[PDB]
Amino acid sequence: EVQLVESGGGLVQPGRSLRLSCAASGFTFDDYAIHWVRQAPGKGLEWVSGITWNSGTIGYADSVKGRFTISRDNAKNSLYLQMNSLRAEDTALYYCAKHHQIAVAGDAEDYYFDYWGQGTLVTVSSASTKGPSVFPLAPSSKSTSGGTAALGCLVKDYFPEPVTVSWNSGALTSGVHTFPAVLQSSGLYSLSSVVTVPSSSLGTQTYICNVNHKPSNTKVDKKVEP
Amino acid sequence: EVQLVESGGGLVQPGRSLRLSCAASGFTFDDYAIHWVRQAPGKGLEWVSGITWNSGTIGYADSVKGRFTISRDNAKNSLYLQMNSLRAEDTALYYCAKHHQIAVAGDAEDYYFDYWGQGTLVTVSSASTKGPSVFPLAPSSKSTSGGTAALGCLVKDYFPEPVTVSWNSGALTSGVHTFPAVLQSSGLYSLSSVVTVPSSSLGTQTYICNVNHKPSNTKVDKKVEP
Amino acid sequence: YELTQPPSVSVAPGQTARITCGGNNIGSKSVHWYQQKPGQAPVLVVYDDSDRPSGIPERFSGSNSGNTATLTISRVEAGDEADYYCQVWDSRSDRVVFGGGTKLTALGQPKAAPSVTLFPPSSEELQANKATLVCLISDFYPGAVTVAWKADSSPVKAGVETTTPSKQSNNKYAASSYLSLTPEQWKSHRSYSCQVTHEGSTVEKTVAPT
Amino acid sequence: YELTQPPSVSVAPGQTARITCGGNNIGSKSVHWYQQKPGQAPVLVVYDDSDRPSGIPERFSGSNSGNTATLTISRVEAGDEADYYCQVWDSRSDRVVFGGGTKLTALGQPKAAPSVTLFPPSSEELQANKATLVCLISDFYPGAVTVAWKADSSPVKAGVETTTPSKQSNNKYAASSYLSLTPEQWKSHRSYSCQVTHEGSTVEKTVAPT
Amino acid sequence: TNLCPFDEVFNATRFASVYAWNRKRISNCVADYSVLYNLAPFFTFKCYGVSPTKLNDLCFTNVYADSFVIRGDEVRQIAPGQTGNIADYNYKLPDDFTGCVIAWNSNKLDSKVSGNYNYLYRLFRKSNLKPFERDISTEIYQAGNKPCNGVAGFNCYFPLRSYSFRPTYGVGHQPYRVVVLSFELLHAPATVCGPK
Amino acid sequence: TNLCPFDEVFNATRFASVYAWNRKRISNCVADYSVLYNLAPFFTFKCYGVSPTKLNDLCFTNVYADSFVIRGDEVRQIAPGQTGNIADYNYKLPDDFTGCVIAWNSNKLDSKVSGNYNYLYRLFRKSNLKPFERDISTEIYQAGNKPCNGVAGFNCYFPLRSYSFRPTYGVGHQPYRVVVLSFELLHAPATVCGPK
Ligand SMILES: *[C@@H]1O[C@H](CO)[C@@H](O)[C@H](O)[C@H]1NC(C)=O
Ligand SMILES: *[C@@H]1O[C@H](CO)[C@@H](O)[C@H](O)[C@H]1NC(C)=O
């Protein structure tokens, strides 16, 4: 139904600007107020700004006034948020939240969000983007049970973390444990995945680990073999 | 001594502009900060604006900001306060206040007033200026005591109330009690000023009541006789 | 910032007066005090919460607690009834913030009888049409005076009367009263007279017929 | 405005939990609640303190009275462990005030032994100098697991390790570990290994001794 | 019948900015140009091309309703063929316009004693705006000759300034909510008619 | 010995506006032109006429120290023979200027949003200013053809605009405390020498 897809986000130096977008699809982008709300990693939520059905700001926070500017386009079904003079304390997953009510004329201002998105990790630091390095973790011949052998990838050396691993085309929703990354004392990270991988007799997965890294644009489609 | 004479004030229609002035003397008008502070009849005091020795505004109150503008000229010792877009609530007795502690560059900001002025009544209404109707009071020849006399003027029908009635300048300094005015149910005022004048009929013969009304420039020179 | 002063305060001659001013956290900025007698300009009496200017007697002390500043007056005489204001710089908003009014009133002053004086309509004003009459009561300390024009041998109240409220003068009230009801037709001659009433007593002065 | 919530509220999966959100005068303005599983997007729970959206079970209820809004979840289960936030409008400053959410954790869940899976350096990295030996640990409920490294049959911990803190996955914690400080000719001898020691027993799993 | 939605376009909680004015199509309804005079004692009704008493006799197909908040000294600029810092970079009406520009004071609805960056206006722009054009872009304005590289520095300004709305201002600085009711008539069955 | 008051016009709490720039007759003292070199490292020190290396040696009679706050891109206008809006209606320097203009960013203590109207510049004026001329008048400027009363309106422009110095604008719209050190050599015993 409602698909509030959010685009725009990556590594930007302190003091520069970027523009975020939020393409709506499913409802009428002319009667629902849509807001922006950030969430620092493991540090709670925070409200940024918002716009009513008519393009008008419903206010800003106590730390983004004068630096952020929100705009609405009712014809293209897209909400925009301009972020100027970014600092180190603006790194968060910016969400694009809707409003449940239809915004009737005579009522009381009360905004509560009903549909959310996924967000774009807007990291602000002085480091530079690095390219991933996919490696074919070998599914060793240790065979006790049926699917005891597991194969995966070892994506490493990437500073930003909008990393997404795929296996066939954006499919194979079976057991795929994408373990969280870890800052290895150098600013970079390291990802890893593991599948079930039953008895290998050429009737198994296509042996593909699609790694999409946006801030360091590179599409790796390297295969895995025993 | 220090004399902060304040001029440039009278009647102005709602939605107009006047310009006040504060001519200083006796001290150095180059090292003391001078502020503007108003006072309606009663209703306590209120700080309008202020300026430092260098012509830098110390700020405005959150009731006349963006409408007033304080200036300062160090060549000719005088202060200024332009008052654009005057409304009905700006009807007060504006003061010109000095400040001790000439505030060497290394110091904490703190402004207290030690030498005040006399005031300049600024009334903002839609009525028109009227002129006094000075009438001499009759000093009836009674025999209650040795000085059983009472003579004065009967100023009446004047809308603005800055009137400063005075007898023969530098001559009469005895009991000259000037009774306050009254806002009768016609928009105008009325004032009296009776002097004791112990029995001197056909004696001093200095019964001259000078009535000055600034918003009308009607300097009356009425003479009183038995 | 927003200071808070008591609306009024009373004290008898012999005791001490205590005027307080509060705020969010009034403990860092200074609390400067002023004294405004009725009909004059405010004079500073206490600055830096402890000091006093040259001329102010050794009777104006002060203290500044965490959230309350006080102005302690010593032995108070009759010539001390005025309005006192406390000042705060408030460097947060860059605006000198004053306080409310605090009318200190000495309780126990002697009751002074008023002095009424009447002036008949002049000859220069009766030229075309003025016919004005004025009643003046000068020296009486307690207010609440009712100038009832017992004129024309009747309680004239429908006639135009001013009856200005009480005022202050050298620590003693004073008011006035006008009567322009006569349209140059006061030839009725029924003993025009002004009648004041202070607290039960009354003093009256007749008006000349012609 | 400023909302304050308890940093953590735990309850056994037999009774109800009490999540509160108090402010200054939050008795009239509407109080909305949100639920956020670890990793996913915040979902809506009972809003306006008296009604819930479509899909949320009847177990979720709310009540606001004076200075406390209570989100009383009835019959708490394991799948309800999430970060609950409360929302308010605060029409005074034109904002949307959230609060530090509460981590509801169902206390008293069954134990889970972690499963370890070792992956030696891959085939297409020995020609280069990578040295990225990876040690993974599967799902387990009680966190705080320490990865014991057994490199060359000897305790080698001075090398570059990761030891990422435990994270959340369908109410089962999982982590990773990386240590291949070797000169990138890791095939020295004596079966470089990895050990995962939970609270109590320790799990062992090694790789080929080459 | 089906009254046109002139209730949420006029009596709304928060209006639009000058650089992001909102259009709204109003159709398949019967417009009543008489309920507008409940809004504000101070209510100008300047019209162009149509008599203020002729809208209740003609039929249109798509009546559009813009909305923005401008300061007082800037309403006059919302008129066919008039210059100014708002009618050139924010919103310009065509020289041959058929509508009714409506404005009223709103110092009580949206004016807080602080200044809120809620209402913005475009101060710098490359060229003038074409009739009925909205530019929500916020690129750094190059005011000199050196490139800006997306950083607001010397000779590189941010193209949006924020109005200051406080109730203590004069009539020439209090916020004014403005709505431009356009009227177009194409080769199509006219739905928006008058109350018959 | 007696150091000149170079600390009162440089470390003052609040500076003047561009239309009311304050002078200070620095005389009968010993000026040390070295405390204004390392303090405030962001220091544009454009010296016209005199050189910064031979400044601690020459003796002048009355060195005048102006002071005002202008924006950034309008610092280039404080120079001999320069045009614009802040160099012809607010502050004008002679073509034979002999001094050193000194400016430094003050986005920390002068960008108070509570202040803002605390700094004003003149935008409209009949004729250009003379060298070293102050005009603190606030009369309404008649910009059209008909005479204007004491009220604003069409072709009735208030001659003073505000500097909404906010801490979020770019470096081109930030306050700069400009101080001009004019050096005159009139016929009189020169007393303001350098450190001997
Ligand atoms: C705006 O609100 C008032 C009060 O509810 C109402 O009388 C008026 O009709 C409304 N205006 C419009 C244009 O509907
Ligand atoms: C301003 O203050 C600093 C520190 O006290 C000082 O070094 C400097 O000399 C002062 N300003 C000038 C230029 O006199």
XYZ file of N, CA and C in Angstrom, chain C residues 32 77 138:
9
model
N 19.508 46.118 41.290
C 19.572 47.540 41.581
C 18.184 48.066 41.921
N 10.509 57.025 58.169
C 9.782 58.229 58.533
C 8.650 58.463 57.538
N -6.927 71.239 49.774
C -5.478 71.186 49.600
C -4.795 70.145 50.482
